[PDB]
Amino acid sequence: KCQPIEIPMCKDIGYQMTRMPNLMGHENQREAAIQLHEFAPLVEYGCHGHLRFFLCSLYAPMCTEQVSTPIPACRVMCEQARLKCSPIMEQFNFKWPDSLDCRKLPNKNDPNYLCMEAP
């Protein structure tokens, strides 16, 4: 089963439902939102316009019930987010955690996993 999106930063994100646990290990959306708040400065800085959608793809993956796997954003989306947001993170130096290392996300039209792009 699925649950409506309750994380404030993932409202009006493109899809309506999610399933716990997410891809970050959290087992409810409350605890998911609290650890998502660590990246709130980067969403606000807008170094990439799709960073909020990419992050929500992992902290609140899409759920429809038919599809049996949580669905993240494409590899294509994450690389651009870490590329274009790296300069400002370099300044503060806290680097993209391996929790978010882009090479875990499936490429678009990848043999074993499905992905999403942003509206």
Epitope: I34, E38, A40, E44, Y45, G46, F92
Partner: antibody, heavy 120, light 102 residues
């Protein structure tokens, strides 16, 4: 609904210390972004210090870095601004304010301020 | 520093400029402050009108410049206006105090 009330203002001599209180009602202090913004009389607003919610990411302005320190105590649901080695330049009305995150990213609620006077 | 002054009449169109750098995000807020009161939020994210703010208020970013425009200045609008930067500067610009021509 959201409301912030400042306390702890008053008079202090140069080099002295003061601690302001920012009492929150309507939202939890823990996991919330609070900013301190001061206004010297007849002058403009000056952002001073801020938390982004978690213990880290506490930021200060250069004019106060080293001398001012942010705290909180979730039981009382109030944040604190410890001010040390005060100079007369720090004479100002001190505001605390909640920074609404997504989708605002703005100080949507302010206290009424408390006056801090540093003088001999 | 001290706020800049601008003299205007009711019904005038005013555009206040907040000069920054292009290395700053568009999470810029605009505030309105009247004597002896706390600032009030007008515009967030450079262009989004806050709730209960009249439609004659407007925000836009162009390069390094953020602007506030009042399309038809009304008597309640004469006050001081401040822009604020987003993370990680959070710095306020110089205020613009709009006073009424008489």
């Amino acid at each position: 609904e959201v409301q912030l009330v400042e306390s702890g203002g008053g008079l202090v001599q140069p080099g002295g210390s003061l601690r302001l209180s920012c009492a929150a009602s309507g939202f939890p202090i823990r996991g919330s972004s609070i900013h301190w913004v001061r206004q010297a009389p007849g002058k403009g607003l000056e952002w001073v210090a801020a938390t982004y919610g978690w213990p880290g990411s506490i930021t200060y302005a250069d004019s106060v870095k080293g001398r001012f320190t942010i705290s909180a105590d979730t039981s009382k649901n109030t944040a604190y601004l410890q001010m040390n080695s005060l100079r007369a330049e720090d004479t100002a009305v001190y505001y605390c304010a909640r920074r609404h995150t997504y989708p605002l990213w703005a100080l949507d609620y302010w206290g009424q301020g408390t006056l801090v006077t540093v003088s001999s | 520093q001290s706020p800049s002054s601008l003299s205007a009449s009711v019904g005038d169109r005013v555009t206040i400029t907040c000069r920054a750098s292009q290395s700053v995000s568009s999470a810029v807020a605009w505030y309105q402050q009247k004597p002896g009161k706390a600032p009030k939020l007008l515009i967030y994210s450079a262009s989004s009108l806050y709730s209960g703010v009249p439609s004659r208020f407007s925000g836009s970013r162009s390069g390094t410049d953020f602007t506030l425009t009042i399309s038809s200045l009304q008597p309640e609008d004469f006050a001081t206006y401040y822009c604020q930067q987003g993370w990680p500067f959070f710095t306020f610009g110089q205020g613009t105090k709009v006073e009424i021509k008489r």
